[PDB]
Ligand binder design. Structure first.
Ligand SMILES: Nc1ncnc2c1ncn2[C@@H]1O[C@H](COP(=O)(O)OP(=O)(O)OP(O)(O)=S)[C@@H](O)[C@H]1O
Ligand SMILES: Nc1ncnc2c1ncn2[C@@H]1O[C@H](COP(=O)(O)OP(=O)(O)OP(O)(O)=S)[C@@H](O)[C@H]1O
Ligand SMILES: Nc1ncnc2c1ncn2[C@@H]1O[C@H](COP(=O)(O)OP(=O)(O)OP(O)(O)=S)[C@@H](O)[C@H]1O
Ligand SMILES: Nc1ncnc2c1ncn2[C@@H]1O[C@H](COP(=O)(O)OP(=O)(O)O)[C@@H](O)[C@H]1O
Ligand SMILES: [Mg+2]
Ligand SMILES: [Mg+2]
Ligand SMILES: [Mg+2]
Lengths: 348, 261, 316, 322, 99, 256
């Protein structure tokens, strides 16, 4: 069993970072009229830790007894779509963004179905029940309009906890009626604290300097930090400060992509780097993640008078990739513009 | 003050089942001569005129004329509350939003009061002129209903031709052809089963079969149907509603393109 | 009760069609021979796909046309039961036909049919091909599946070159003795844009509307933005002049023109304008971007002003 | 009583004005029986339904109007079903009374899919000598080019103020309202050549403020006056960023103006200003960027300060050019 | 029960190579009477169910056995999901699928 | 020129009230002996052979042997036009693209003159040999419709076991089992209600109830039905249509 999820907290008092938000949420769920929640922050900050912790504090013992159900829905076109559901006897958890263009269909039908379902022995447990919408940000406009309709009509019997990142694409009038809970990414010292705790439980003597290296290469992402710690334990048990940390294959692939860019400024190297971009894109990783990795591994090389225009073109081609439908044209346009600007930079 | 009593009760039900799917809203024009109705389909192809005379009702009295908007689906449900032998008394006010129908048992044991809410409609009274027809054919009601019910399986249209041999109903569809002939019958023991044809000029016209299938749900109203057909004249389907009035239909014929092949 | 000129001057034989000369000649070779393969005819509207398929079916069958030819169209219902029943039991039927002549199912506007309709189409046209041959007509081949274009022979009809449109237009005009001006007839070409039925209807319409066929009458009965005004607009955008082009913009906006038609005529004039090739490419890209601004729902005068500003700044 | 828009629908080909060519060509078509299928396209509220209804009532009597005219629009469900329903069933049949062609009047015809347009254009070809269609639409560009190759298209265009005043004067004469000299100018400017908005805003400020002046209709409609836009552009070209931003946000909060109307009036004001050409190119580019920028749902104050920002760059440029 | 672990074939690819021709001549090569199917031609669950237990799961009426039949379903890429569900429920039964 | 005239019209309705649901299309072959129909279903399991002799038609004329392919669902809507006592006459030419059916009323008030389009089809002649069956059961036809419709709910397949105690029909399914026994009835007032079992060896076989429900739509054709079953030949359901023909159903066995 991995220690990333084995030593996960259960109660709100055994949290390692953001104690004040933990106390605020504990006193919020201590009284009645628990409102609609919109939890947000960066990836790996620990939103879902707060969410199952809130579910632990809201209910009794049976909060981690989860199972997968499969529910079929019908589009206006005659086609059956099977959707997945992570559910318990006290709550619901749905990812509704897996259905791309039929997100309004599932957002109407599935929560109409669970709203029309009656809580058996409702006097014993609590007043209402909670529904998690795990990936909610990339839902489209009228899907989120049906979502706020669902929030309005079953306000007495079904409150929702929407979890996402980058709420700019989340519509305004769902943010008005939802209590906004913001979970920041843990700092370098809090990541070092929880790494030292997860090593002290498992009989380990991690030096502080290697914990700083793990925190600074995890880029404020605790799950990735604990996975690096696990992989470092697998690689070598005697821990030295000068330790080779096993970085993930797509980051070092982006590093090789970036040094293939800065090596040559010719169309043949552009063909090679377009092949590398295709190999990166075929693994179903998001192109904004590729863009961010390219800019992070690109700013370690370029001169100080050229970082600003490079960053502006990075934002420009990420935005036009979001407006478009095929990623490789905008990505290789960004790479071609960077090569043209760099060869103008060293040519003069 | 509109009080109108009708002893034979299921004849209004058959009148309504004739209007049941062919038209969804209609206006009742009420005068001292009685009840009048003139409406069209939503497609504006078929015209329906329904006339119920004053003397056919049991006790009819009506001080002022009444233009009355009716949804025939609502009283299609309300006249299904009426029995076959029940007595129907219609009641309305001069400025009513309401309509009252009282269904009475023949032994005066069961009394029923039913209310319908009325809707406003703009009425265009299309004055039908009196025209002489080239062909007038009276035939059984069940026979004509069977004629359209068989010929609606072959195609969507019928070619009806009236000539010196008689009347011919034709159809041509993807399954094949169909031609049913009817001749003038000299002697029947009953006057309700004979086909009798009066003519000036042989005619030939094409009609949609959805409309004729909607028309021939008025079969139990009258035992005999009068089809008045002529060139440039619609297909008049007259049912004589006993001695209390008449139900008349008007179908425009279809366009037939002329081909040399 | 006179017939319109679109149906009156329809061709009755396959050599009167001026659309695609090699395809028409091969269709006539198949009409004189008999073993016509499964064909699909694609292209813009008005090229004459319907009259080519109809003339091929007539010259094949002749007197057995009323039983050996099934014309299914867009105005008829084309559900799953229709391709299950009507097309199937037409393809299963027997007609006493000659040695080379074959049954024909004219499927006009096949791009508008549903996917299950084409799913029931494919087996039928593969199996019953010894007797019936499918002659599909369509506008865009993208809405039709690739297997149907595979089992058919695809015949791309081009947009008509203006010379053959002129030859047919002198044929119709000499058949009617309608007076004309030359530049008005070129205006009828400009209003056509590879749509020959549109050229015939606009000529028809215009003569019935106003006697002499002159640029003023056709441009009055059509009321598109004038080519001279939009061409002078693009010329004023070439030499970096926002103001002189904006009097033309205010002239075309106070005349009540919708922005969609303004940007469409802007692109259509910019297609054939005599300027530098890379400059034309940049102009077409900016006109396309403003056309997405229009199509997304921003139809202000300021979007036209910003289009003019972007065309002005792209010329230094 | 009713609103003035429904009380004065021109019932006669005499009452309507500023559409005399459409009048002359359609009456010339209908007297000699050469009327083709019609496609009436233009802005809203310039009288598309009124002329075709008066023409259909000119042809037929009231006692035969029900069997020779079928009216449909997009209030009903529209698509592939009702083209295979009432429309061709009306079109393929004869007349119940007398003889002659029929009429289908389809209001707001640009709201159907192109499959429905293909079905309808084939219906138009199949039955022509007995049915004359009339399709009323707002935009021509939503209609397939073959359908425009069937039915002759008529452009109504704008309602010019010099033939928009006297109908408003006539409804002023029939219904007594307190209206000053600026009332006609504000009616013919504010309604944007749409006479349905003219008789709706006339009833709105008659019911609301009683008297009809420039100030009453501009406060009821919420439009900014020319003095307001002059003050806004004076603050943008005169004061610094804090003072101009504070002045315009105070004015926008007090008067309830909207940034889209401010942008439109500012654009119609820029070409009055004798800006240098590059500065005007900069202004039109940035203002078109802002008007696309409001269309997605951005915060209005930030785009307001963006307009102030562009005008600050311009005032530095004009002084640097001077 | 002497069936292969791969019960059903799923040949796929672009149009116009000869998958139907190969399947027909291999069925005629392996002593099978050919029988065809279009899936979205009859798109309800019930008619698909009737044909899926009629084309297979049956002997031959001719003489002393004759030759058997193997079902060749075409165009099930566009079949409605209930038809593939019926085919899966008739494939996963453990009265037994034999052809 | 082919011309066949039939006085009892409704028997052709009884004949095709069950043929429109088994086979969507069928071939009529015409010879001087009469009119035959040997046809297969779409899934190569059930065969039908129908024989109508020339003696039972009052007017029969067949100049040359003919093959006509008739859509059996395009003909049933030409069939529902019939009255129960109508007179049916069928005509076709020697180069027939069509098939004419002419109806008259019992009082001959109306003359119907329908004419359907024929169809071309692949033709195979599957010669059924002459074989002895181990078990032959003469049983009432209305009861046979009843037994098939009552084990219609029980399962999807049937098992028939004919042995010395009689015949046994068994169906199994999720609702349970339905088992029936019919014995050799000794004394009945009418011969049509009796059951006559001729046995050589006890025979147990399995078939499909959907096709048996399709078979038992021919219950007004005759008051009796013959069930002929043996070890390997398919099940034979025989309806002796009046004194003028017979209808013959072959149903292939299921695999166990
Ligand atoms: N090549 C041509 N030569 C002569 N007349 C033509 C030609 N193409 C079209 N026409 C005329 O235009 C009319 C309409 O042609 P159609 O074949 O109906 O157009 P289409 O190819 O079907 O395009 P659609 O159906 O509108 S997408 C015909 O009746 C002819 O009068
Ligand atoms: N030329 C005109 N002369 C006089 N009154 C006019 C004129 N044009 C419009 N009107 C008035 O405007 C009212 C509305 O006209 P409509 O024809 O309904 O507008 P429309 O052209 O159909 O635009 P829509 O319906 O919004 S697409 C009419 O009832 C008239 O009172
Ligand atoms: N060896 C061959 N030589 C020539 N023609 C062949 C050969 N094999 C098959 N064909 C023909 O080419 C076609 C084979 O393709 P098909 O199997 O019918 O279509 P497909 O490959 O299944 O692709 P789709 O998706 O059905 S269009 C048929 O028309 C055959 O008659
Ligand atoms: N106090 C803590 N103790 C141990 N692990 C923690 C603590 N807080 C966060 N984590 C770890 O950080 C990871 C954050 O993942 P998650 O909750 O899914 O955040 P996100 O939803 O933003 O990806 C979890 O896997 C969790 O194990
Ligand atoms: Mg066409
Ligand atoms: Mg209107
Ligand atoms: Mg295939």
């Amino acid at each position: 069993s991995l220690w990333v999820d084995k030593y996960r907290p259960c109660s709100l008092g055994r949290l390692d970072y953001h104690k004040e938000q933990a106390a605020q949420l504990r006193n919020l769920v201590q009284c009645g009229d628990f409102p609609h929640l919109l939890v947000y922050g960066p990836s790996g900050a620990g939103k879902k830790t707060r969410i199952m912790c809130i579910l632990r504090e809201l209910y009794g013992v049976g909060v981690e007894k989860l199972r997968i159900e499969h529910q079929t829905i019908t589009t206006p076109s005659k086609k059956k779509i099977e959707i997945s559901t992570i559910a318990s006897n006290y709550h619901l958890e749905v990812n509704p963004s897996d259905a791309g263009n039929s997100d309004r269909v599932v957002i109407q039908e599935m929560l109409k179905t669970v709203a029309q379902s009656q809580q058996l022995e409702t006097n014993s447990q609590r007043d209402f029940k909670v529904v998690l919408l795990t990936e909610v940000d990339k839902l489209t406009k009228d899907a989120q309009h049906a979502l706020r309709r669902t929030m309005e009509k079953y306000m007495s019997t079904c409150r929702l906890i929407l979890c996402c990142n980058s709420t700019s694409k989340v519509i305004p009038p769902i943010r008005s009626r939802c209590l906004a809970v913001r979970v920041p990414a843990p700092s370098i010292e809090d990541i070092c604290h929880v790494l030292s705790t997860v090593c002290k439980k498992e009989g380990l003597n991690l030096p502080s300097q290697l914990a700083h290296r793990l925190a600074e290469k995890s880029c404020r992402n605790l799950r990735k930090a604990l996975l690096m710690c696990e992989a470092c334990r697998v690689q070598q048990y005697p821990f030295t400060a000068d330790q080779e940390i096993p970085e993930t294959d797509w980051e070092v692939y982006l590093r090789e992509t970036a040094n293939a860019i800065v090596s040559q400024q010719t169309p043949q190297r552009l063909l090679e780097v377009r092949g590398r971009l295709y190999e990166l894109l075929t693994h179903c990783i998001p192109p904004e993640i590729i863009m961010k990795g390219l800019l992070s591994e690109l700013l370690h090389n370029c001169d100080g008078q050229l970082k600003g225009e490079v960053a502006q073109m990075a934002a420009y081609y990420e935005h036009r990739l979001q407006l478009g439908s095929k990623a490789i044209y905008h990505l290789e346009a960004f790479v071609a513009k960077f090569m043209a600007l760099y060869k103008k930079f060293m040519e003069d | 003050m509109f009080e109108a009593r009708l002893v034979q009760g299921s004849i209004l039900k058959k009148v309504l089942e004739a209007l049941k799917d062919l038209i969804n809203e209609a206006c009742w024009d009420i005068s001292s001569s009685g009840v009048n109705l003139q409406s069209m389909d939503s497609s504006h192809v078929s015209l329906v005129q329904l006339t119920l005379r004053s003397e056919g009702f049991d006790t009819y009295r009506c001080d002022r004329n009444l233009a009355m908007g009716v949804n025939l689906t609502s009283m299609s449900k309300i006249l299904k509350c009426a029995g076959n032998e029940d007595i129907i008394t219609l009641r309305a006010e001069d400025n009513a939003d309401t309509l009252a129908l009282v269904f009475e048992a023949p032994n005066q044991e069961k009394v029923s009061d039913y209310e319908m809410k009325l809707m406003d409609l703009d009425v265009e009274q299309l004055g039908i002129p009196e025209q002489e027809y080239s062909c007038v054919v009276k035939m059984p009601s069940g026979e004509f209903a069977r004629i359209c019910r068989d010929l609606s399986h072959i195609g969507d249209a019928v070619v009806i031709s009236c000539a010196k041999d008689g009347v011919k109903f034709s159809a041509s569809g993807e399954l094949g052809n169909g031609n049913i002939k009817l001749s003038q019958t000299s002697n029947v023991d009953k006057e309700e089963e004979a086909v009798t044809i009066e003519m000036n000029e042989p005619v030939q016209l094409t009609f949609a079969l959805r409309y004729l299938n909607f028309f021939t749900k008025a079969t139990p109203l009258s035992s005999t149907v009068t089809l008045s057909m002529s060139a440039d004249v619609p297909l008049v389907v007259e049912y004589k509603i006993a001695d209390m009035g008449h139900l008349k239909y008007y179908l425009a014929p279809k366009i037939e393109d002329e081909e040399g092949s | 009760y006179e017939l319109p000129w679109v149906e009156k001057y329809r061709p009755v034989k396959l050599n009167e069609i001026v659309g695609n000369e090699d395809t028409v000649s091969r269709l006539e070779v198949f009409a004189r021979e008999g073993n016509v393969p499964n064909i699909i005819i694609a292209g813009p509207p008005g090229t004459g796909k319907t009259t080519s398929i109809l003339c091929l079916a007539r010259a094949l069958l002749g007197p057995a046309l009323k039983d050996a030819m099934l014309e299914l169209n867009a105005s008829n219902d084309r559900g799953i039961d229709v391709v299950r029943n009507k097309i199937k039991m037409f393809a299963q039927q027997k007609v006493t036909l000659p040695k080379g002549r074959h049954k024909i199912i004219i499927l006009d506007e096949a791009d508008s049919m549903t996917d299950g309709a084409q799913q029931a189409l494919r087996r039928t046209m593969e199996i019953y091909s010894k007797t019936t041959r499918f002659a599909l007509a369509c506008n865009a081949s993208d809405k039709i599946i690739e297997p149907i274009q595979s089992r058919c022979a695809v015949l791309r009809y081009t947009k008509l070159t203006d010379a053959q449109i002129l030859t047919r237009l002198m044929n119709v005009i000499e058949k009617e003795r309608v007076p004309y001006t030359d530049d008005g007839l070129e205006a009828i070409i400009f209003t056509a844009q590879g749509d020959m039925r549109q050229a015939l209807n606009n000529l028809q319409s215009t003569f019935s509307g106003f006697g002499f066929i002159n640029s003023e009458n056709v441009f009055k009965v059509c009321d598109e933005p004038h080519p001279l005004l939009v061409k002078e607009m693009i010329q004023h955008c070439v030499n970096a002049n926002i103001d002189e082009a904006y009097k033309i913009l205010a002239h075309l906006w106070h005349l009540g023109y919708s922005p969609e038609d303004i940007i469409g005529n802007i692109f259509r004039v910019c297609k054939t304008f005599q300027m530098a090739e890379y400059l034309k490419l940049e102009f077409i890209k900016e006109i396309g971007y403003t056309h997405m601004k229009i199509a997304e729902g921003v139809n202000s005068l300021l979007q036209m002003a910003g289009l003019l500003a972007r065309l002005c700044q792209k010329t230094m | 009583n009713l609103p003035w828009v429904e009380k004065y629908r021109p019932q006669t080909l005499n009452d309507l004005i500023s559409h005399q060519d459409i009048l002359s060509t359609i009456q010339k078509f209908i007297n000699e029986d050469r009327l083709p299928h019609l496609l009436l396209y233009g802005p809203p509220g310039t009288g598309k339904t009124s002329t075709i209804l008066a023409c259909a009532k000119q042809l037929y009597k009231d006692k035969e109007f029900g069997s020779m005219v079928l009216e449909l629009n997009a209030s009903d469900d529209r698509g592939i079903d009702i083209i295979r329903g009432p429309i061709l069933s009306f079109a393929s049949t004869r007349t119940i009374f007398k003889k002659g062609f029929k009429l289908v009047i389809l209001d707001e015809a640009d709201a159907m899919t192109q499959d429905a347009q293909n079905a309808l254009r084939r219906v138009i070809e199949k039955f022509t000598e007995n049915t004359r269609f009339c399709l009323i639409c707002n935009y021509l560009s939503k209609i397939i080019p073959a359908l425009q190759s069937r039915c002759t298209r008529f452009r109504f265009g704008p309602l010019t103020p010099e033939l928009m005043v006297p109908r408003l004067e006539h409804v002023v004469e029939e219904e007594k309202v307190d209206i000053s000299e600026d009332g006609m100018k504000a009616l013919v400017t504010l309604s944007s050549g749409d006479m349905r908005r003219a008789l709706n805003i006339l009833q709105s400020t008659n019911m609301a403020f009683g008297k009809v002046t420039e100030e009453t209709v501009y406060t009821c409609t919420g439009h900014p006056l020319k003095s307001d836009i002059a003050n806004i552009l004076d603050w943008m070209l005169n004061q610094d960023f804090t003072t101009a931003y504070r002045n315009i946000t105070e004015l926008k909060t007090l008067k309830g103006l909207a940034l889209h109307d401010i942008l439109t009036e500012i654009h119609l004001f820029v070409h009055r200003v004798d800006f240098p050409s590059s500065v005007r190119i900069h202004l039109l580019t940035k203002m078109a960027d802002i008007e696309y920028r409001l269309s997605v749902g951005t915060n209005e104050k930030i785009q307001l300060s963006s307009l102030i920002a562009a005008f600050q760059v311009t005032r530095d440029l004009i002084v640097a050019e001077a | 029960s002497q069936r292969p672990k791969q019960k059903v074939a799923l040949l796929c690819g672009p149009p116009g190579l000869g998958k139907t021709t190969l399947a027909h001549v291999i069925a005629r090569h392996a002593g099978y009477s050919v029988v065809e199917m279009n899936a979205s031609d009859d798109r309800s669950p019930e008619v698909f169910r009737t044909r899926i237990e009629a084309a297979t799961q049956m002997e031959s009426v001719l003489g002393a056995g004759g030759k058997p039949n193997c079902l060749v379903i075409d165009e099930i890429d566009g079949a409605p999901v209930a038809a593939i569900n019926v085919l899966l429920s008739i494939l996963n039964r453990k009265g037994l699928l034999m052809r």
